[PDB]
Amino acid sequence: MRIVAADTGGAVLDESFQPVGLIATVAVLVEKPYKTSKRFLVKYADPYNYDLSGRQAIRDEIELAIELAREVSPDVIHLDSTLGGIEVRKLDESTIDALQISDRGKEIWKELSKDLQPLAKKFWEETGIEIIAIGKSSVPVRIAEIYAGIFSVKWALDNVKEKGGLLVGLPRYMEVEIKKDKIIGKSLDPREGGLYGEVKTEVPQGIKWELYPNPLVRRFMVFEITS
Amino acid sequence: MRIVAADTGGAVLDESFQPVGLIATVAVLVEKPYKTSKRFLVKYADPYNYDLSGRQAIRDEIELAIELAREVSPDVIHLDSTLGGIEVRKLDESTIDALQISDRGKEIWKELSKDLQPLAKKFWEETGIEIIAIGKSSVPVRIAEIYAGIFSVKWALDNVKEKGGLLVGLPRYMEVEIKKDKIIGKSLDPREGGLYGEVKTEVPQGIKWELYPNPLVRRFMVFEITS
Amino acid sequence: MRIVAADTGGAVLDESFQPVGLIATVAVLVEKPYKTSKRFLVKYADPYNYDLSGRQAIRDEIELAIELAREVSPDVIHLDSTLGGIEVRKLDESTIDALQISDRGKEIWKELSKDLQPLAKKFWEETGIEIIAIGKSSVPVRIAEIYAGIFSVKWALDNVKEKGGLLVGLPRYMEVEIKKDKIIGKSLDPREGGLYGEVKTEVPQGIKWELYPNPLVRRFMVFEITS
Ligand SMILES: [Mg+2]
Ligand SMILES: [Mg+2]
Ligand SMILES: [Mg+2]
């Protein structure tokens, strides 16, 4: 199978570890053995002006996934919404209320439906490719998320000399290593079977960084950097 | 404590990783230090003709557990249904509706009750041994599950030359190693404290195998083999 | 951030692994990098005369947290109740029923409210320090819990020659190592990012101990000791 997926991750935090906004939306192509991606797109948000409700993220995600899928012709697109793998082109109001999910989950999706259902329907008509609301069940979605963490660290590297110091909340239970002009991201959960990513990027001189637990959100790490 | 438990696991998958049917039901005897089993029974299903609803599995499980328990006289039997450890001989309709579980969980159990409650009651009258619906809380159930994964890999080894190629979905977050005429199965979750199993079986020549993440089901691995 | 947190853990078990009562309540001060504590208080319960409902634990916890906080002046106290981080001084009845939790969760808290809400309100008036019901989201709460496990092993060491043999159920997925007059406790979950604790205490001669899975409670270990 060849799968395109997308997710958003990486948060700028304040000094009390409260999220200000998110940093990176990433679309990935994933193929066997489904542990990493060698083909991906990133869109950087403005974390100092972000919508933390989930709406902005999923819209950026589905658009970036479609952008990558138009090029690499995957068998399917995985979207990060955990709805049991239903096709997004089928998500009209009546289908959404029938879903076995939360009522505010239904709130958000009945609002998203107006744009996303026609979008997925048109993309399917054009390409035959489904966009499925699989969410946390998807390994390609998790690989996208790990890359969003990696690209959030790239963003921190690229912005810390202007900003002085940054606190970046990473996606759940992942670490990064910074080597000579390379960031490697790895899941911390061995149950996931060895998921990772790598981005080549220039590491500036005159910086120091550290990775440690977010004390307010168990199993999430913080990347702290100063110049 | 000496505990008999049972579970079913291992799925034949198609090329899109969709489950066709399950492969192995295993009953284990587990004693201190509760990390593995050295005494077990296996029943192989026909995965190309299986009931994926859960009904077939739990019936095969309770029968195989009783078969092993009749020999090894455990203190208790653990059944893989997560109902808080209630004795199955007590599971009449009124008790089942009183349970703090899903209504389709109640659906399945009110149907199973007609056979399983009298079965557990009779076994208890004969032996004093309870059959408890403990499910995911039980370590012996997880050890049975790991052995079902192992025996599913044995089944793949034994059938791949006739079948040409096989995709086996393993139970959640476990790996296998194939050594000289031995399969070793291990949990991937260090939180479980080092659970494992081993089955001695002939490894055929002229095969190649690989273990990798199921991209559609996070934290589940696939064993792929060709001849 | 400087955080005080508390939790209770460690259970005396009978020979069928059933809990008799809990052993240690611990308050910790946690600072960057939020992996351990070097400043803590312990209160030992009488496990052979304990209230397993949760009431005794949370009362001992909030009092011990306040006792430590009065000395070390943390920015905040984390209490082990998972209510989304609401301030305990705000937990009147109407707020509790408004919470998005279980109805027996509301049962317990509407009873606790009569003492704990005025207590938290007074402490805040005195110090400006909030007591927040953050629960499982808190890393400092987990570090307190790991120390409760460690101190429960100290309690077992200190009592095994009078008791002959003890079975101690540890907090979820943690291990201990016993070195020369030191107990080291570590989380078994690498997703938590390397949480640990250490207590210096005399290890008696003429004992043997073992750590292994609790077969009735997956991902929880037992510390067994005899003299
Ligand atoms: Mg997401
Ligand atoms: Mg099962
Ligand atoms: Mg607690």
Domains (ranges, CATH) in chain C?
1-227 (3.30.420.440)
Query: Using a CB-CB distance cutoff of 8 angstroms, which residues of chain C are in contact with residue B188?
Result: none
Q: Which ligand is nearest to the CA of C7?
A: 3
**In sequence order, what are the beta bridge partners of B25?**
B8, B43
Among the partner-chain residues B35, B136, B191, the one whose CB lies closest to the CB of C188 is B191
| Gap from CA of B26 to ligand 2 centroid (Å) | 10
Nearest residue to A147 via CA among A202, A197, A92? A197
Closest by Cβ to B137, choosing from C188, C216, C221: C216
Give the separation between CA B57 and CA B7, rounded to whole angstroms: 8
- Experimental structure resolution, Å: 1.5
Contact A110, A36 (CB under 8 A): no
The span from the CA of A77 to the CA of A28, in Å, is: 10
Angle at A222 between CA A220 and CA A226, to 5 degrees: 175
Cα–Cα distance for residue pair B179/B166, rounded to 1 Å: 19
Listed residue (A31, A32, A49) closest to A40, CA to CA: A31
Question: Which contiguous run of DSSP H or E holds residue A62?
Answer: helix A55-72
Residue with tokens 């593995």: B36
- Annotated binding-site residue? C75: no
In terms of CA atoms, which chain C residue is nearest residue A175?
C193
Q: How was this structure determined?
A: X-ray
C61 annotated to bind ligand? yes
Nearest CA to A139 out of C177, B217, C214 is that of: B217
- Joined together, the tokens standing for residue A168 give 């970046």
Please state, as a whole number, how many other Cβ atoms lie within 10 Å of the Cβ of residue A202: 11
Q: Is the dihedral of CA A190, A195, A200, A203 positive or negative?
A: negative
Cα(A165)–Cα(B132) distance, rounded to whole angstroms?
56
B218 and A136 within 8 Å at the Cβ level: the answer is yes
The Cα–Cα gap between A89 and A96 comes to: 12
Q: Which two tokens stand for residue B60?
A: 């095969």
Among positive and negative, which fits the CA dihedral A58, A132, B212, B170?
positive
**Which chain A residues are closer than 8 Å to B210 by Cβ?**
33
Residue B84 C-alpha from the chain's centroid: 19
Ligand 3: centre distance to CA C8 (Å) = 5
Q: Which two tokens stand for residue C82?
A: 């998972």
Ligand number, closest to the Cα atom of B81: 2
Question: Which residue of chain C is at minimal alpha-carbon distance from A187?
Answer: C191
**Cα-to-centroid distance, A218 and ligand 2 (Å):** 29
Element (H, E) at A210: strand A208-213
Determine contact: B198 vs chain A, CB below 8 A: no
> Which of B210, B214, B218 is nearest residue A142 as measured by Cβ atoms?
B218
**What is the spatial distance between Cα A226 and Cα A161, in angstroms, rounded to a whole number?**
8
Whether B137 has its CB under 8 Å from any CB of chain C: the answer is: yes
Q: Residue C208 contacts by C-beta under 8 Å, 6 or more apart in sequence?
A: C225, C226
Three-class SS of chain C: CCEEEEEEEEEEECCCCCEEEEEEEEEEEECCCCCCCCEEEEEECCHHHCCCCCHHHHHHHHHHHHHHHHHHCCCEEEECCCCCCEEHHHCCHHHHHHCCCCHHHHHHHHHHHHHHHHHHHHHHHHHCCEEEECHHHCHHHHHHHHHHHHHHHHHHHHHHHHHCEEEEEEEECEEEEEECCEEEEEECCHHHCCCEEEEECCCCCCCEEEEEECCCCCCEEEEEEEC
Which of 96-135 (A) contact C at CB < 8 A?
none
Distance from CA of C22 to the nearest CA of B (A): 20
Q: Which residues of A touch C142 (CB under 8 A)?
A: 218
B195 part of contact set with chain C, CB < 8 Å: yes
Residues A227 and A224: their CA atoms lie apart, in Å, by 11
How many angstroms separate the alpha carbon of residue A143 from the centre of ligand 1? 11
B32 touches chain C (CB under 8 A): yes
Q: Are C24 and C43 in contact (CB under 8 A)?
A: yes
- Three-state DSSP string of B57-122: HHHHHHHHHHHHHHHHCCCEEEECCCCCCEEHHHCCHHHHHHCCCCHHHHHHHHHHHHHHHHHHHH
Tokens of A142: 């998790």
Q: Within an 8 Å CB–CB cutoff, is residue B172 touching chain C?
A: no
Kindly report the nearest CA distance between residue C138 and chain A, in angstroms: 5
**C173 contacts chain A (CB < 8 A):** no
Q: Which residue of A has its CA nearest to B175?
A: A193
Query: Chains B and C: how many Cβ contacts under 8 Å?
Result: 55
The three-state secondary structure class of A41 is strand
For tokens 């079902």, the residue is: B148
Closest CB from C15, C17, C213 relative to B192: C213
Pairing relationship of beta strands B76-79 and B130-133 according to DSSP bridges: parallel
Gap between the Cα atoms of C199 and C84, Å rounded: 31
Per-residue b or e along C23-36, where b marks 16 or more CB atoms closer than 10 Å to that residue's CB: bbbbbbbbbeebbb
Whether A193 and B219 lie within 8 Å, measured CB to CB: yes
Which ligand sits closest to the CA of B80?
2
Q: Which two tokens stand for residue C183?
A: 């107990």
Tell me which residues have their CB within 5 A of the ion that is ligand 3. Answer: C 7, 80
The three-state secondary structure class of A168 is strand
- Determine phi and psi for C11, rounding to 5 degrees: -125, 135
Considering every ligand atom shown, identify the ligand nearest to the alpha carbon of residue C80 and give its number. 3
Partners of residue C189 in chain A, C-beta under 8 Å: 219
